[PDB]
Amino acid sequence: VDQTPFEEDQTWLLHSIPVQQLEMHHHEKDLQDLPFINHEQFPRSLEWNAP
Amino acid sequence: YPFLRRPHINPSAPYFWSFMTAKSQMAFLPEENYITGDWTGKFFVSKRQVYTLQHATSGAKVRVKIFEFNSPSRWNIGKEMNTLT
Amino acid sequence: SPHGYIRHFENEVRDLLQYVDGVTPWKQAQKIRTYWEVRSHHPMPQFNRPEVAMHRNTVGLLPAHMWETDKKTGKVKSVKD
Amino acid sequence: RIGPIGLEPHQFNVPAELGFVEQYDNLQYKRYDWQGWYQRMLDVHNRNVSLRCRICDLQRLDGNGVQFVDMQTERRLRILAQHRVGMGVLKLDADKYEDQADNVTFGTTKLSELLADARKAQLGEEYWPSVELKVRKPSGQSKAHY
Amino acid sequence: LDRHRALADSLRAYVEFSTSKRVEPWDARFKPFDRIEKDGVYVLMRYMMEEKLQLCNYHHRPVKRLFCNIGLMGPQITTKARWKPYRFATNPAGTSKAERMYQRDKTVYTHGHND
Amino acid sequence: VSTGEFDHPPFQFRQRHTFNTTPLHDANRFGGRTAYLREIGPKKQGRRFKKDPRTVQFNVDVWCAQQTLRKRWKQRDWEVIEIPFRLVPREQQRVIPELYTDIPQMTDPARNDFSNIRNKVYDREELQGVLFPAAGAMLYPPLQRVDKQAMTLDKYL
Amino acid sequence: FPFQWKTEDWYEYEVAKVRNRRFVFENTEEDGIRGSEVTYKIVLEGFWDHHVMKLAEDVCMFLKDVGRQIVEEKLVAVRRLLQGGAVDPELLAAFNCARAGPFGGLDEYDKEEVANFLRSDLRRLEEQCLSVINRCNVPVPGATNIYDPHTSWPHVEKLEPWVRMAEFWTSEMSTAHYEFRKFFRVIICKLPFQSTEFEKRMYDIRHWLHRQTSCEFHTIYRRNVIHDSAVFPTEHDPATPTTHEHHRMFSFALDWQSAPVNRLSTDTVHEGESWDAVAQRLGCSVGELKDANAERE
Amino acid sequence: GVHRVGYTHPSTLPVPCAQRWDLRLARARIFQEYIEEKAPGAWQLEDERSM
Amino acid sequence: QHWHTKRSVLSSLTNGRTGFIVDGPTGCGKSALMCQVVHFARSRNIVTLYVPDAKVWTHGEWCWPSTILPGFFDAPDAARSFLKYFAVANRATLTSWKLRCTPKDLPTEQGERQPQNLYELCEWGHRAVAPASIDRQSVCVKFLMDELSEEKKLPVVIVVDGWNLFSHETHFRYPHPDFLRGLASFNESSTDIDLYPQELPRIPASRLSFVRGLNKMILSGDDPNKFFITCTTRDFKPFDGISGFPNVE
Amino acid sequence: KTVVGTHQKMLQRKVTCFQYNQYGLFKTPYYRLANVDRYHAVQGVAGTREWVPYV
Amino acid sequence: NTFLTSSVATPPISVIRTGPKWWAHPERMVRQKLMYFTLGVDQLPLRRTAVIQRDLQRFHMCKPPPRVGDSTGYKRSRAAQLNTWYRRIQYQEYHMQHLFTRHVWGLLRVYPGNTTKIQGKADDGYVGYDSVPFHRYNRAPLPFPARELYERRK
RNA sequence: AAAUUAUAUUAUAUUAUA
Ligand SMILES: Nc1nc2c(ncn2[C@@H]2O[C@H](COP(=O)(O)OP(=O)(O)OP(=O)(O)O)[C@@H](O)[C@H]2O)c(=O)[nH]1
Ligand SMILES: [Mg+2]
C-alpha cells in the first residue's frame, strides 16, 4: 500500500513532514567539510573529463 | 562561526523523550552504560549514561563530573544525565 | 583490495560478521537493552508528541496513584518515592 | 589490438575501448621517503577504468548464425543499463578495486553479466520488455455517459 | 524533590490540555466560515462532521485534517479561509476574552501547551 | 518562465508592517509555511535553526519542489500501462532510449510528425481491443470525430 | 525562425546534453582526424599560463618528429603487406570458426577471400598513415597553428584553469583575496595503430619537463572482450523468482554470490546410462559428449 | 490516492511480455542495488535548483 | 427561432451534432460571444439557459449530495442563483409553460401556492428559507431538467460559458467513509482522518444533477430541439516547468 | 532472506557487544579537530576567515 | 485582506520620496487605475501623478548646473514653486488612494488591519487579534473572537 | 546670506520585573 504524489496544496501543507533542523549531510559532500572549507585533494580542472 | 559546530556544547512536558535524547527508542544504550573491558574503577561516569532501573534500585555510587546522586527515584529512568542536572 | 563505499566490501562484511559471531558469547549480548526496555520502568513511559496525534492523549495514561494532588487548584502537591 | 580472441561458437568478440589515467610525479614527489604513499595515492585515485562499447558493434552474427544483439535484446540492454547507456554507447566506469587490473577484470565481468541478462530476449516473447504507453484517461465523450 | 513533582505537574497539565475542549479554530469573519449557521459549511458540519469535531475537542490540527478529509469543500477551505493563530487556538472552550491567553499558569513548562 | 518567489528574504533588522516592507515571518509568505519557523515573541537546538540561512533556504527549496511536483502531477490526464511490443502502434515499434540518454527523439520525421515520443499520449478509446480483450462488449463508445470537409457554420455554409 | 519551443523539451535537452558529456567513442574506424585506433591525451599543468603554452610547443614539436618517424615505420611495413604475403593458417581458421554463416551453414572462405579481408583493412592503414604524415609536414615555423587538428599533428586543446580563492583576515580589520591557480594544455595524439614504441616515448616526456611543470597521461585504446556464453549462459527465469527481500541492506554480502556462477564441468555416469542417455541428461549432442571424452571409448 | 501497487505475471496476460518490476529486480541483481521498502511514492522531489 | 421549418438546414450547420463548442486561446472572444448569443436568443423571445460561469458549479464553495437522486451531488448556491436568474430572465415564456411531468403533491408551506407553471416551479425552488432551500433546489433542478427533456416543440437554446469544466472532474472529492461510518473514539477505532490527510477520487461533472440533465438531453437522440451553443475557458493558472509561491499582493 | 527474525536481532545484539568492547575506537567526527596549524600555535576556526583550507 | 498585523504609520513625504520603487511603481499604479475604472470614476489625480513622475524619472540622472549668482531670488523661487506644486498633487493621490480603498473594503466585506478605520463600519481603529490583548489607543479590552464589522450571509 | 559641501534608507535597544 502506497500513496501517490498529491495534487492539492492543502495536502502537502497539512501533512506532518518535519523540517530541517540540524546540519544537513550528503553522502559524498561530507569529505568536503562545508562550501567554505571545500576540500580538494588534487588540483584537477573543473572541466577535466575522465578518459 | 558555522552552524552548530561549537566545540563546547531544560524542563519540557510534551518534548520529554525527544529533547537532547536519542531519536529512536529501537536503538540501544550508549557505551558508558556498559563496561567495556577490564577496569580498575572510574572516578566519574560520563554525562551520556542513561539512568536505568538499576541506578535507583542498587544505588552503590553515582558520580557525574561534581555531582552526587543520593536521591533515587523512578522519574529519572530512561533519560541521560544531561537534563537530570 | 576494495576501495570507496561499503557496497564494494562483500567479503570483508562476511568475514567481519563471522568473526563477530565467533568471538562474542550470547550471555554477554543478552545484557544490552534498547531505550524502550529501560523506559518501561518509568511510571509514565508513553504519551503522544504534539506534532501529529496530541488529541489522543487520554486521562487513563497518567500514573495518578504515584503522586498526591491538590484539591483546590488541581496541581500536583507531592510525589511518591 | 590486444585482447583474447574466441573461436568457439559460444564466444563472441566485442571490440571495446578502455580508458585509464597514468600519473607520475616529477617535481617534488619524484623521490624521497614520501614517494611510495604519494604514488599509491596517485594510483588509487586513478583507479577508474572506463569500458566502452558501441551497441552497433554488438549487432553482429554469433557463432551459431543468429544475431548477437537484436532489437529486443537492445531494448532489454537499454532498460537493464539505464544511465550506463548514453548516445548509443554502453559505458561502464569500474572504480571498485584499487588497482586498474582488478577494475578491468570487474568491468569485463559486469559487461558479460549484463550481456547475458540482455540476451534473454532471444529466448521468447515473454522476455521482450513491455512498451510503456501513456494511455489517457477516458475522454469527456466517455465521461458524458457516466 | 521539587523537580520530580514539577515534571509530574507539567505532564498532568499537558494531558489535561490534550483532554479538554477548545474554541472553534476557524475565523468567523472570513469566507466560507463567515456564512450563517443555517446554510453552507455549518450545515455540513452539523450533519456529517459533528461527532468528528466533538471527539477531537476542537484542536486546530485535527479539525483542519477533518476538513481536508471531508472532501466536499476542499481544497479551497484550508487555504482561502483564514484560521485563528496558534496561541489563539490554544485557548480553552468558552474563553470570550483576550486576557485568558495571559491568565494561564506559567509555572509549568509545557511550552505553551497548558490551558 | 515563472514569477513566483523562490529565495528567502535575508536576515536584517526586525521589519515592521509598513509600506514596501513585510515582517520576516509572515503568514502571507510561502502560504504560511513560515509558521513552522517563526517566533511570535518580539532550547538552543530549537532556536538556532530558525535563524540559519542555509536551513531556511533548504526548507523553502523543499516547499517549492513540493509545489512543482503537485503542479506537474495535476497536469497528468494519463497513466502508464505496460503494453507488449506486438500490440503497440507503429510509432512505438522502435528502440526508445531511456530518459536523458540520447537526443530528444522525434516521433516520425518521415511521416512529418516532429514531436517527442515521451510526451505522446494515446486515447483510451482507440486501445480497447488491446487493453480489454476479455470484455467483448465495447465498454467505451467510439470517439465521434468531426468531418473536416463537411460544409458547416465554420465555412460560411 | 524564430525559435519558440515547449519547455518540457528544453528541460529534457539540457539534462541530456550534460549527462552525455563523456559518452564518446574516440577510436572509431573512420576517415581522418575524427577516426583513430588509440588516443593519447597528455594533460600538462603549470603555475603560469605562458609556462604551459611554451611547454605545449616543446612537446608537440617533439611528438611530431617522433610520431612521423613511427608512422613512416608502419607505412613502410603496410606497403610491403600490400605488395604480397602469405595467409596465416590461424587467420584462415578464425574466419571458418562459426557453425552457421550468414548464408546458412558453414561459410568456407578460401585463401583468396581471407586475403581480401586483410587487403581491405590494410588499405585503410595507408589512408590513415598518410593522414598523420601529411599533417606532420605542415607546421613550418613561418606558418604554425598547433591548436587546429586539420593543420598539425598532434594538436593542442584548451582546458579551463583550476582557480581557488581564499578569504582570510589581513589583521577583523580587512579581508584579503588571494587565489591559487594553475593552467592546463592537453595534447591529443590519435594514432591508427597501437605502438608500444610510441607509448614508451610518450611516458619519458616526464623526465625533461619544464620547471615546476608536471603532467599526467590519458590513454583510450581498443581492446577485444570475449563474452563467454558458457561461463555466462543465457537461461530461463527460475520457477521461484527473486523478490525485494533478496535486495535488502547487506544483501550484497549475505544473499548473492559474485558473478559468475560455478557450473560443474564434471559428472559421474549412473548405472543404466549410455552415450545417448548421458547426453540426454546433460542436454548436449551425443557426438559433442564423445568429443569432450575422447579418451574413453 | 492511496492504492496498492499491482503486478501482472506474463503468464496471465493475453500477450506475454517482460514487466518493468522484474527488469528492476534483474538490474538490482546485476548491480547490487539496495531496494528500500519504506520509500514512499508521494515523495518524488527533484532538486530543482540544479535540475 | 423557427427550427421546424429549417431543421435540415440546422442539421447541416451543426453536422448533426446537438450544438457548437467554441475553443481558442485564452482572452479571445469566447465568453463575449456567449453573452452576445444570449443577447441574440433572448432578444428574439427564445427560452435561454445561461450559465455565465461554470466555475461556480464545478469549482464552487461547497458540494452537497442530491436529496432524491442517489449517488449524485449538487452545488446548492449556484443552483439557487440559477433558479432565480433563469426564472426572472424567461418569465415571459415560463409562465405559459405548463407542467407536464411534475408531481402536484409538492411540499408547500402555509400561504404558498402549488406551482402550475415552470416559472412557478423555479419560484418554489429558489425562494425559500435556509436550510429548506438546500433540498428545495435539488428537487427543483431534478424536475426542471425532467420538464425540459419532454418539450419537443419549443426551441431551447442552452449557453454554457466554460463547457470544458463540465466535461471533466469538479474540484470536490468524495468524503472519507469514516465520516459516515460513525466512531466511538479516535484512539482505538482504526482510523486516520484526524492524523493524516489523503486525496480521495475526484468527483466528475456527470455526477452533478444539472450536468446529468444536460448530458441526458445531449446523448439521448430524441431531442432535436435543444441547441447547445457553448464554449470553453482557459482561465487557469500558468505553469512553465517550475513554480514558486505566488506573491499575494 | 537468509537471516531473519531472531537471528537478525541476535546478530545485532552481538555486533553491538562487539562495538562497545573496542576501547579506543575512533568515533570522533572530522570537523572537531580539523583546524590545527603546523607552523604556528594560533588556533583558528574552520568556516570563518581565520582559516584557509588549501594550505 | 490577509494583512491583519499591527502597522507603523509613515509620513506622506517619505512615501513619495521612494519614487519608482514603491510610490510610482508602474505595476502598482496600473492596479490603482483599475479600482477607479471599475467604479465609473475618472482617474485624473492619478493621471496627474503619472505624467509628473514619467518626466521626473527621465531627467533624474542629470546633474544640475552650478548657479553662478542671481541678484533676485526669482528663478530659484520658481523652481521651488513648481517643486512644491508637484508634491501637493501627489499628496492628493496619496489621499485619493487611501480614501477609495477603505471605501471599497467596506463594500466587499473586507476586514482591514489593526488600528485601521473604515468610515462606514468602524469609526475607531478596527483591531483584531493583536499581540497586545487590549486596544492600543482606545484603552479597551479586546473580546474573543474578533469584532465582526459586517453581516454573516455571503 | 548665494554655491551646496550634506550620504541618505528603515528598524532596534535597556531590572516591565522575575
Ligand atoms: N465588447 C466586446 N469585448 C470583447 C469582444 N471580444 C473580446 N472582447 C474583450 O476580450 C476580453 C476577453 O473576453 P473573454 O471571452 O472572457 O476571454 P476568454 O477567451 O473567454 O478567455 P478565458 O476566459 O481565459 O478562456 C474581454 O474582457 C472583452 O473585453 C467583443 O466581441 N465585444
Ligand atoms: Mg472566458
TrEMBL record, chain D:
Superkingdom per UniProt: Eukaryota
Name recorded for this polypeptide: Uncharacterized protein
Source organism of this protein record: Trypanosoma brucei brucei (strain 927/4 GUTat10.1)
Section covered of the full-length record: 657 to 802 of 874
TrEMBL record, chain E:
A GO term from the CC aspect: mitochondrion
Protein name as it appears in the record: Uncharacterized protein
Source organism: Trypanosoma brucei brucei (strain 927/4 GUTat10.1)
Residues of the full protein shown: 55 to 169 of 169
UniProtKB/TrEMBL annotation, chain F:
GO CC terms of this entry: mitochondrial small ribosomal subunit
Domain of life: Eukaryota
Name of this chain's protein: Uncharacterized protein
Automatic annotation (TrEMBL), chain H:
Top-level taxonomic group: Eukaryota
The protein's name: Uncharacterized protein
Organism (species): Trypanosoma brucei brucei (strain 927/4 GUTat10.1)
